[PDB]
């Protein structure tokens, strides 16, 4: 719902392990945010 | 307060609920000349950061009443508006 369709299929459909890492990255972004921490990704994602 | 927030950071949200009752009383009855003690407390709220998540519903109505009150002086209204800008 948040990412543009192009970048979704790039990361979440190409290969399983990357898709799993980014899936779990969204959880990291939420948890670490609550401790004045911001995770960083190379293809910049909008805040989910 | 501003120094405790920068020191603890994420861990401040455990202690913030104790301070909230006093901060809400400050807005209700501030007799400070030009409400400069209110302006200072706004500048503090800017530092609070993502701590305010669970308590924003408490702090925001006072801030909203502050910048919408016409009786209140313009400096204190700009300070409230700039605070909402930062917190956004």
Swiss-Prot record, chain A:
Modification after translation (UniProt): O-GlcNAcylated by OGT upon glucose sufficiency, promoting interaction with small GTPases Rag (RagA/RRAGA, RagB/RRAGB, RagC/RRAGC and/or RagD/RRAGD) and subsequent recruitment of mTORC1 to lysosomal membranes, leading to activation of the mTORC1 complex. Acetylation is decreased in response to fasting.
Extent of the signal sequence: none
Cystine crosslinks: none
Known tissue expression: Highly expressed in skeletal muscle, and in a lesser extent in brain, lung, small intestine, kidney and placenta.
Places the protein is found: Lysosome membrane; Cytoplasm; Cytoplasmic granule
Top-level taxon of the source organism: Eukaryota
Function: Component of the mechanistic target of rapamycin complex 1 (mTORC1), an evolutionarily conserved central nutrient sensor that stimulates anabolic reactions and macromolecule biosynthesis to promote cellular biomass generation and growth. In response to nutrients, growth factors or amino acids, mTORC1 is recruited to the lysosome membrane and promotes protein, lipid and nucleotide synthesis by phosphorylating several substrates, such as ribosomal protein S6 kinase (RPS6KB1 and RPS6KB2) and EIF4EBP1 (4E-BP1).
Protein family per UniProt: Belongs to the WD repeat RAPTOR family.
Subunit structure: Part of the mechanistic target of rapamycin complex 1 (mTORC1) which contains MTOR, MLST8 and RPTOR. mTORC1 associates with AKT1S1/PRAS40, which inhibits its activity. mTORC1 associates with DEPTOR, which regulates its activity. mTORC1 binds to and is inhibited by FKBP12-rapamycin. Forms a complex with MTOR under both leucine-rich and -poor conditions. Interacts with (via TOS motifs) EIF4EBP1 and RPS6KB1; interaction is independent of its association with MTOR. (Microbial infection) Interacts with vaccinia virus protein F17; this interaction dysregulates mTOR.
Protein name per UniProt: Regulatory-associated protein of mTOR
Organism: Homo sapiens (Human)
Highest classification ranks of the organism: Eukaryota, Metazoa, Chordata, Craniata, Vertebrata
Shown chain mapped onto the complete sequence: 326 to 373 of 1335
UniProtKB/Swiss-Prot annotation, chain B:
HEAT repeats (start-end): 14-50, 51-88
Domain of life: Eukaryota
Post-translational modification, as annotated: Autophosphorylates when part of mTORC1 or mTORC2. Phosphorylation in the kinase domain modulates the interactions of MTOR with RPTOR and AKT1S1/PRAS40 and leads to increased intrinsic mTORC1 kinase activity.
Tissue specificity annotation: Expressed in numerous tissues, with highest levels in testis.
Localization in the cell: Lysosome membrane; Endoplasmic reticulum membrane; Golgi apparatus membrane; Cell membrane
Disease cited in the entry: Smith-Kingsmore syndrome: An autosomal dominant syndrome characterized by intellectual disability, macrocephaly, seizures, umbilical hernia, and facial dysmorphic features. Focal cortical dysplasia 2: A form of focal cortical dysplasia, a malformation of cortical development that results in medically refractory epilepsy in the pediatric population and in adults. FCORD2 is a severe form, with onset usually in childhood, characterized by disrupted cortical lamination and specific cytological abnormalities. It is classified in 2 subtypes: type IIA characterized by dysmorphic neurons and lack of balloon cells; type IIB with dysmorphic neurons and balloon cells.
Assembly mode: Part of the mechanistic target of rapamycin complex 1 (mTORC1) which contains MTOR, MLST8 and RPTOR. The mTORC1 complex is a 1 Md obligate dimer of two stoichiometric heterotetramers with overall dimensions of 290 A x 210 A x 135 A. It has a rhomboid shape and a central cavity, the dimeric interfaces are formed by interlocking interactions between the two MTOR and the two RPTOR subunits.
Recorded family membership: Belongs to the PI3/PI4-kinase family.
Physiological role: Serine/threonine protein kinase which is a central regulator of cellular metabolism, growth and survival in response to hormones, growth factors, nutrients, energy and stress signals. MTOR directly or indirectly regulates the phosphorylation of at least 800 proteins. Functions as part of 2 structurally and functionally distinct signaling complexes mTORC1 and mTORC2 (mTOR complex 1 and 2).
Domain notes: The kinase domain (PI3K/PI4K) is intrinsically active but has a highly restricted catalytic center. The FAT domain forms three discontinuous subdomains of alpha-helical TPR repeats plus a single subdomain of HEAT repeats. The four domains pack sequentially to form a C-shaped a-solenoid that clamps onto the kinase domain.
Protein name: Serine/threonine-protein kinase mTOR
Organism (species): Homo sapiens
Full-protein residues shown: 1056 to 1143 of 2549
């Amino acid at each position: 719902n948040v990412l543009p369709r192009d970048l979704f299929q790039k990361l979440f459909r190409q290969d399983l392990l990357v898709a799993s890492l980014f899936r779990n990255f969204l959880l990291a972004e939420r948890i670490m945010r609550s401790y004045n921490c911001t995770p960083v990704s190379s293809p910049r994602l909008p805040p989910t | 307060i501003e120094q405790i927030v920068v020191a603890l950071g994420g861990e401040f949200k455990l202690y913030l609920p104790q301070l909230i009752p006093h901060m809400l009383r400050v807005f209700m009855h501030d007799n400070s000349p030009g409400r400069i003690v209110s302006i200072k407390l706004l500048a503090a709220i800017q530092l609070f950061g993502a701590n305010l998540d669970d308590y924003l519903h408490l702090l925001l109505p006072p801030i909203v009443k502050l910048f919408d009150a016409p009786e209140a002086p313009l400096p204190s209204r700009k300070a409230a508006l700039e605070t909402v800008d930062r917190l956004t």
